[PDB]
Structure 1
Amino acid sequence: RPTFYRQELNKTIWEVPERYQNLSPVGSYGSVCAAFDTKTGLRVAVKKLSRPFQSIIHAKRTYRELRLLKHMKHENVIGLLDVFTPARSLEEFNDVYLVTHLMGADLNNIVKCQKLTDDHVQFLIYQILRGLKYIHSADIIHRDLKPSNLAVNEDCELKILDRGLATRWYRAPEIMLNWMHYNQTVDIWSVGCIMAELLTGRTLFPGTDHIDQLKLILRLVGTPGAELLKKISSESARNYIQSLTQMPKMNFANVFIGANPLAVDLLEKMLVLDSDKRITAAQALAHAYFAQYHDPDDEPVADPYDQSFESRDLLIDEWKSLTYDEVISFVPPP
């Protein structure tokens, strides 16, 4: 094991291996320091989880987060450099620290302070969909893909994160109707919204609440056809939908007038009401808009990810001991 030191920072008492040095507050389910890794000469992020075992909910979340990050090994997805605890045994086990690459800015920190070239839009979105193929191949649905959940460096390299450094704006329509049985393509909807915005400099659907959101969506893509309406069991949803004057499907070419026409085509295949018909991550990767970036031999899939634990109601000490096992068995990257 290594030797630890304690330090006060912003009311929280930090205790880390000496290998981590120059700790400084980056921000704020835990708080995050930037730190110098003396082992590699690289700057890193060190997140102290707050109250990781406060309850059954926190504890399972803590385990969920550690299981996810141990699994994610892909250039466009946040992954884990280190995890530790000052605890000497399970009996003392009370804090968990997570270490990842220091990510300086999110996609939003870009869009707002620039106007993106088409080639930027191609590189950014290709990276998203490359990691999303990987995420999806693990049978994970991201569910909250939005600009604050995407890390982008000065080199315009991107990774998908679990959590940032308004959600509804990027949420698939089926989610705001509480449909339940989402497939992965709820994340494609979100990618379409992000893309639109990168091209346009404007939020595609700045809904004020969930009802407003559905309104703004139908104006673009138009009222659902017969083949779709017949799948909405909710009487109230049906009535709200049909009460909203029969809206024509706008021409995407006019909404995105001036965009690379191939970006318009891709957008049309992403932002489709019927999630059955939404282009998948792997499909999208082969769309000619990414011809410059696509390489089918460098778009890998994930090892299958065991998420049966999600189906379990366990005791705090059980989630705690599972988490403890995951820390102990962590094997760092190369």
Structure 2
Amino acid sequence: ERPTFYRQELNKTIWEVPERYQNLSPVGSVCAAFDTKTGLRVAVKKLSRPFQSIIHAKRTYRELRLLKHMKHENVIGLLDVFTPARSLEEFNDVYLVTHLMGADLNNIVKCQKLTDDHVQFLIYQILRGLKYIHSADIIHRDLKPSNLAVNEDCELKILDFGLARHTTRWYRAPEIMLNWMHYNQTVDIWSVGCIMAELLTGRTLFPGTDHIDQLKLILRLVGTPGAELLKKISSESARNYIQSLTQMPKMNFANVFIGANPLAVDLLEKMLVLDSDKRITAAQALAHAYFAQYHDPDDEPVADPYDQSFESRDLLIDEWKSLTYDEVISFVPPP
């Protein structure tokens, strides 16, 4: 039976939600709400114009397919998905509900020089969630402190994984900033390295104010590409653009992160390698000695196979919209 919906206007946007969700407060657009069925606080996301472009329509479907197929302690879970629409013809709005967390990594870390055990615990949970996500052949692509939510005791959940496509920039792998012809899952490991460096020092590792500055800040630490990496460039113009870059030697990290745990420095060296092929994976990083006090190979699960044949499809907005409506109708809330 269709619950009763109520309408309200928050910051010039109309929100139409079941009466179950009370006291909506702005935090797609996101509101914190009180779930009257459980007595818990929830985050309700209203997707912005979900079916007004092919990009939006496919991203809407993608979000729902990722959320319905991904179950892990360090990955956000879907509590509810709803629409005020009573039929496919009137289906134009989609709302997604998750648990509301205590805070996002950003506010917790704002120029904070965290303790080593705190860093270990946070990074371990990010890598545990990434191992799982990567095992389903999904790349987060935009991992940053703002999409890493933590409760009051530092238990972490990864948000928005697999959604974005290279359409901040402080956490973006150099191969994306240089627009290399291909990239792998370790694009997320570069982001982990940047977040870990920041947790250890209380400073953003690469705070560029523009694209040119960003590349200069990255390459002055990791160095310009060597002879071995240069050979991996398929085209002459790309190869020639790469050589036009100033020329910088790779810096020693023990010097940059003075006073950090040496195992933390050693792990940062393996995450912040310019050559994507030599960068440590999430599963390999979990086995690193820095995480000796958290690592358990029997409690770092992999994901079930994920059918993403839809990603190669070029469908009309109405087709993406009908596929999304089928996923909304078939949704079964977790117990």
Fold match by TM threshold 0.5: yes
Deviates most, 265-274 or 60-69? 60-69
Give me the whole-angstrom Cα distance separating, in 2, the residues matched to 1:247 and 1:89. Answer: 60
Contact 1:130 1:285 in 2 (8 A): yes
Distance 1:239-1:314 versus aligned 2 partners, 3 A rule: closer
- Equivalent residue, structure 1, for 2:94: 96
CA distance in 2, matches of 1:164, 1:137: 12
1:232 and 1:165 mapped to 2: Cα distance?
A: 28
Consecutive unaligned residues of structure 1, counting only runs of 5 or more, are none
| Mean Cα deviation higher: 122-131 or 43-52 | 43-52
Aligned to 1:114: 112
Deviation at 1:291, TM superposition (A): 0.9
- Looking at structure 1, the residues matched to 241 and 322 of structure 2 have their Cα atoms a distance apart, in angstroms, of 48
SS at match of 2:41: strand
**Residues 105 and 165 of structure 1 are in contact (CA less than 8 Å); yes or no, is this contact kept in structure 2?**
no
| CA-atom RMSD in angstroms | 2.3
Q: Secondary structure at the match of 1:276?
A: helix
Shift of 1:55: 2.0
Would you say the 8 A contact 1:121–1:195 is kept in 2?
A: yes
2:215 is aligned to: 214
Distance 2:137 2:211 in 1: 27
Contact 2:63 2:163 in 1 (8 A): no
Kindly state the Cα deviation for residue 42 of structure 1 after the two structures are TM-superposed: 0.7
Q: Which segment drifts farther, 221-230 or 33-42? A: 221-230
Between stretches 165-174 and 258-267, larger displacement belongs to 165-174
Asked if the contact 2:148–2:157 (Cα under 8 Å) also holds between the matched residues in 1, the reply is yes
Structure 2 residue runs without a partner (length 5+) = none
The 1:209–1:237 alpha-carbon spacing in structure 2 relative to 1, beyond 3 Å, is farther
Give the alignment of 1:229-240 within 5 angstroms: 229-235=230-236, 238-239=239-240
Q: Give the 3-state SS of the residue equivalent to 2:32 in structure 1.
A: strand
Q: CA distance change for structure 1 residues 86 and 245 in 2, over 3 Å: closer, same or farther? A: closer
Alignment check: 8 A CA contact 2:31 2:43 kept: yes
Aligned pair in 2 of structure 1 residues 213, 113: CA closer, same or farther (>3 Å)? closer
How far apart, CA to CA, are the structure 2 residues paired with 1:143 and 1:11?
31
Q: Which moved more, 1:224-233 or 1:32-41?
A: 224-233
Which stretch of structure 1 is more off in the superposition, 67-76 or 218-227? 218-227
SS in 2 for 1:168: coil
**Equivalent pair of 2:138/2:162 in contact (CA under 8 Å):** no
Written as runs of structure 1 = structure 2, the 5 A alignment for 1:92-171 is: 92-112=90-110, 114-162=112-160, 167-171=168-172
CA contact (8 A) 1:146 1:194 kept: yes
- In structure 2, relative to structure 1, the CA distance for the partners of 1:67 and 1:164 (3 Å cut) is closer
Moved more, 103-112 or 295-304: 103-112
Cα distance, 1:113 vs structure 2: 5.3
8 Å Cα contact 2:124/2:294 also seen in 1? yes
Contact 2:229 2:275 in 1 (8 A): yes
TM-superposition CA deviations, 1:159-204 (whole Å, max 9, x none): 1111899932211111122113211011111111111111111111
Contact kept in structure 1, 2:139 and 2:161, CA below 8 Å: no
Shift of 1:124: 0.9
Q: How far apart in 1 are the matches of 2:30 and 2:82?
A: 14
265-274 or 83-92, larger mean C-alpha shift: 83-92
- Change over 3 Å in CA distance of 1:262–1:317 after alignment to 2: same
The answer (yes or no) to whether the contact 1:148–1:164 under 8 Å persists in 2 is no
SS in 1 for 2:205: coil
Q: Deviations 1:129-186 (Å, cap 9, x if unpaired)?
A: 0110111011011111111221122221211111899932211111122113211011
Of residues 276-285 and 306-315 in structure 1, the stretch that sits farther from structure 2 once superposed is 306-315
Aligned partners of 2:231, 2:289: CA distance in 1, in Å?
34
Task: Compute the displacement of 1:260 (Å).
Answer: 0.3
Describe the SS at the equivalent of 2:278.
coil
Measure, in 2, the Cα distance between the counterparts of 1:324 and 1:175.
Answer: 34
| Distance verdict in 2 for CA 1:5–1:208, change over 3 Å | closer
* Separation in structure 2 between the aligned mates of residue 250 and residue 31 of structure 1, nearest angstrom: 41
Question: How much does 1:53 deviate?
Answer: 1.3
Check the 8 A contact 2:59/2:163 in 1, yes or no: no
Partner of 1:133: helix, strand, or coil? helix
What is the alpha-carbon distance in structure 2 between the residues aligned to residue 218 and residue 12 of structure 1?
43
Question: What's the CA shift for 1:285?
Answer: 0.6
Shift of 1:43: 0.6
TM-score by length of 2: 0.92
Q: Which moved more, 1:216-225 or 1:306-315?
A: 216-225
Q: From the superposition, tell whether residues 234 and 204 of structure 1 become closer, same or farther in structure 2 (CA, over 3 Å).
A: farther
- What whole-Å deviation, never above 9, does each CA across 1:23-46 have from its counterpart, x for those lacking one? 2222xxx22221111211111011
Which has the higher mean CA deviation after the structures are superposed, 143-152 or 124-133?
A: 143-152
Moved more, 8-17 or 120-129: 8-17
Shift of 1:60: 1.3
TM-score when normalising by structure 1:
0.92
Change (3 A) 1:295 1:193: same
Aligned to 2:66: 68
SS in 1 for 2:214: helix
Please say if residues 150 and 164 of structure 1, whose CA atoms lie closer than 8 Å, have aligned partners that are also in contact: no
